[PDB]
Amino acid sequence: ARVAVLISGTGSNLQALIDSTREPNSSAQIDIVISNKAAVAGLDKAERAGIPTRVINHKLYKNRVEFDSAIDLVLEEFSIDIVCLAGFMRILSGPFVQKWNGKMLNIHPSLLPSFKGSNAHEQALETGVTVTGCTVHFVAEDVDAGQIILQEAVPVKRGDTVATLSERVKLAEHKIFPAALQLVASGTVQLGENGKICWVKEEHH
Known about the structure:
It comes from Homo sapiens. (6R)-10-formyltetrahydrofolate binds at residues 64, 89-92, 106, 140-144. The active site is at residue 108. The record marks 144 as: Raises pKa of active site His. By secondary structure, the chain is α/β, with parallel strands linked by helices. The chain has one domain (1-205): Formyl transferase, N-terminal domain (Rossmann fold). The chain has helices at 14-21, 41-48, 64-77, 94-99, 120-127, 162-186, and strands at residues 2-7, 29-35, 53-55, 82-86, 104-108, 131-138, 148-155, 189-191, 197-199. The strands form two sheets. A seven-stranded mixed beta sheet has the order 3-2-1-4-5-6-7, with helices on both faces. α1 packs parallel to α6. The longest helix has 25 residues, at 162-186. The radius of gyration is 17 Å and the shape is globular.
């Protein structure tokens, strides 16, 4: 499967994803990284890795649909099969999300449905949970919404700060984002017609 990563900044987990695709039995290759913002660190990560990049500036388009159509055209040109969102900060239009239904993954630094929205590590600490985690899911129209592929529980430790909790969750993300991509890229996990996850036994051995 040919994979695009959409970013807006540092491309968190992008290196984890690249490294996983270089493993011997990978089902995925990262073929393009697209940012809506010029000269961000995630672009440099992609370029240093030899991966094509594009910048699509939302200010050059009249509205969200036209902007997202420009993203989709690049995806079409590069024959992309699967999109991963790695810190992408714009809300994708309904038409775009519908088109990519079941082929677009995002990650969130909580065990959804807990701690939706921004600042999930601070929300976990303020709430006083002892277990948090991260979640990889298919993207649906409501943000953080969409069917869950993988989750990993991560402990909150006595004394944690936002920084120490965030680095522990990030280590889990580095595990589950590539693992989820491989499941989807291999066809082991697909989104069924019923809109629920399907774990498929593949014909090819």
